[PDB]
Write a protein that binds this ligand. Structure first.
Ligand SMILES: COc1ccc(CC[C@@H](NC(=O)[C@@H]2CCCCN2C(=O)[C@H](c2cc(OC)c(OC)c(OC)c2)C2CCCCC2)c2cccc(OCC(=O)O)c2)cc1OC
Length: 128
């Protein structure tokens, strides 16, 4: 499935090159620009625990998914990953626990040492 493709073909976009965040572009976006730290970003996404039993999607939201990039409003994997995206791009992102919830987890929703998988579409981004 999609996660297996990311493991075997994904790009390691981590600074440490530890394979903690692996990416595949599924749909190429527009232009060349990718967001800067402090930019407000607008996304649609869906996500899951790698090993089963919990699934999330922005399509269930009343309002669009918005956050300021690089400001620790989301897990590390997203601050790293969404920063690499172009407007319109859709990517798959596989996120090891060190870039997500760690050994602590976020119980009872997210267990200890969970790997997460996301499909992310960057709708737009704007300056601060
Ligand atoms: C800097 O570190 C952190 C910053 C934020 C958090 C909180 C969870 C933080 N979650 C996340 O960063 C990641 C990436 C962005 C989408 C949501 N997300 C999640 O892990 C997903 C998530 C979705 C959640 O609600 C939609 C959620 O809130 C209950 C949540 O809490 C742990 C986690 C999970 C759900 C189960 C399947 C796997 C994905 C969060 C949730 C909801 C919104 C949000 O930002 C936008 C906003 O507030 O409107 C930030 C944890 C953090 O570290 C543990």
């Amino acid at each position: 499935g999609a996660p297996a493709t990311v493991t075997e073909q994904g790009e390691d976009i981590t600074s440490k090159k530890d394979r903690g965040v692996l990416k595949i572009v599924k749909r190429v976006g527009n232009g060349e620009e990718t967001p800067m730290i402090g930019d407000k970003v607008y996304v649609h996404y869906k996500g899951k625990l790698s090993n089963g039993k919990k699934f999330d999607s922005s399509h269930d939201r009343n309002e669009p998914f918005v956050f300021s990039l690089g400001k620790g409003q989301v897990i590390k994997a997203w601050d790293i990953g969404v920063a690499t995206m172009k407007k319109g791009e859709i990517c798959h992102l596989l996120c090891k626990p060190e870039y997500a919830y760690g050994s602590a987890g976020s119980l009872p929703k997210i267990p200890s040492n969970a790997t997460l998988f996301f499909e992310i579409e960057l709708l737009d981004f704007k300056g601060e």
